[PDB]
Design a protein around this ligand. Structure first.
Ligand SMILES: O=P(O)(O)OC[C@H]1C[C@H](OP(=O)(O)OP(=O)(O)O)[C@H](O)[C@@H]1O
Ligand SMILES: O=P(O)(O)OC[C@H]1C[C@H](OP(=O)(O)OP(=O)(O)O)[C@H](O)[C@@H]1O
Ligand SMILES: O=c1[nH]c(=O)c2nc[nH]c2[nH]1
Ligand SMILES: O=c1[nH]c(=O)c2nc[nH]c2[nH]1
Ligand SMILES: [Mg+2]
Ligand SMILES: [Mg+2]
Lengths: 145, 150, 145, 150
């Protein structure tokens, strides 16, 4: 099955998460995980009024290897690390390793990667594919007839 | 406790429902319950290709513990071969009245709470009794202040 | 080209049109032209608090035929359609509902003069893609990089 | 006079911009101007298949007729082979500052008012100077009272 997420709904979830991160004063900045955390990070920055927004870029290369293309400085103290979702937590482990003192959060969370995040908004089944807004668009759809 | 329903989601539910109503040759037309069933009815008409869309207008004003119903406009017939669509069913008060007027009709809705659930022939989404459904036509995209004034 | 109309935008235009039809006490009801005027008519009914909404179903075979029609000459009623291109269907509506206030959301040059009021001007060669004919689906990246 | 920009429309404009930036092999990465260029930058990154997305954080403060700029954080280099993106250009104040920091970068925006229009390498929509652009991240779908109480 597929879970369709529209921009409106994603924003509704982002505002819900933003309220739990209050007061905003306790945060020095936001570190968005490219590319999934970019949009959610932008919404939290707007809601919390945080202007210090940085990023962390990671790519993949028998085994799968994580490659840090771009890295945000520090250990994450006073920072919020955000990604759109946590499926298995394979990428979440790398982030935790780089930013141990950071408050890692996501919008969506499947069972397997759920223990790896400090907070999330929506629970999603392990076998369900979450279709994000940036991957979709408004186009013509033929009538069922 | 509120359930927000955007236009996109409503359309997705309407299309789900339309796929169950196939084929479209079995339907003479569609009777939309004004005003809530107008949009869903228009969406079914597009998907099924039904050009014959009619309406049934019933107003209702609550007076303490009783309802004043009034049929402002009624579609002729017993609903034979017609689809009677409404946006949702809460207590089932409207549904009961409709089944009366159009007994031989296929009554369907998009949303259905536990009370009205047994009164509809088919629906798409289950919604709790305590949950209020916020429809798209009652909402709008407007400026919303930040959670913090930082 | 193709003029894309989303649900949000269609609703905005509908609200602008509703404000011009005020006050709402001068109206006995609304007659929606199936199927284009169904959604706009539903929005007007909500904004103007009108509960009496009827429909008129016209069909082609150019030979127009009325499948179903609302009784009366349209005195005090608002006849609405989503748009007016050439005014072919509009001319037929005028004949049926003379005293009626005919309005649309969009209007092309050729059919412009056939309506009492509209909101958006659209070129004659431009195809208006309505919200009910579209949907949010996956759209592949402009590049397979 | 205000110009409403929904999420869907912003995406359509972003996709049109991405088509002109093709091929994507000529780009080493994207530098988004926080916070306005964050969403547009994310959309380009998805469309172009770019993974190296960085930011430049500039804080502004109007003190009567003069502006005080303060760079909280900035991407390394002169923007050679990079795409610097912001959501819009109003007076062009931020654009001039950015262009000085990244002179070799391809500076683009989605919207452009007459005043700042000559400062961008490429943009998508022409906006009047007197028109206020209402971005999606500042809005939300909420209940809107009927225009009449009939
Ligand atoms: O299950 P019930 O408790 O009977 O109520 C459900 C009705 C009432 C509500 O419409 P109204 O509140 O009547 O307003 P509107 O005419 O705008 O649809 C809704 O759209 C359904 O038609
Ligand atoms: O052309 P100018 O007059 O210089 O202004 C245009 C700037 C400012 C505004 O952002 P800000 O108001 O700076 O806030 P934010 O950080 O949210 O983008 C907008 O997103 C552009 O980046
Ligand atoms: O918009 C509405 N939402 C509801 O949940 C409901 N129940 C009754 N009437 C209703 N109207
Ligand atoms: O949201 C915004 N809209 C505008 O039109 C604008 N001009 C400067 N800064 C702006 N921010
Ligand atoms: Mg109703
Ligand atoms: Mg800015």
């Amino acid at each position: 099955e597929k879970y369709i997420v529209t921009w409106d709904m994603l924003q509704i979830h982002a505002r819900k998460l933003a309220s739990r991160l209050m007061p905003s004063e306790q945060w020095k900045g936001i570190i968005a995980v490219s590319r999934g955390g970019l949009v959610p990070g932008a919404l939290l920055a707007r809601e919390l009024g945080i202007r210090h927004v940085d990023t962390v870029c990671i790519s993949s290369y028998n085994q799968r290897e994580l490659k840090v293309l771009k890295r945000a400085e520090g250990d994450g103290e006073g920072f919020i690390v955000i990604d759109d979702l946590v499926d298995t937590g394979g990428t979440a482990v790398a982030i935790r390793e780089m930013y141990p003192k950071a408050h890692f959060v996501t919008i969506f969370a499947k069972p397997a990667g759920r223990p790896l995040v400090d907070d999330y908004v929506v629970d999603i089944p392990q076998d369900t594919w979450i279709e994000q807004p940036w991957d979709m668009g408004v186009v013509f759809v033929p009538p069922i007839s």
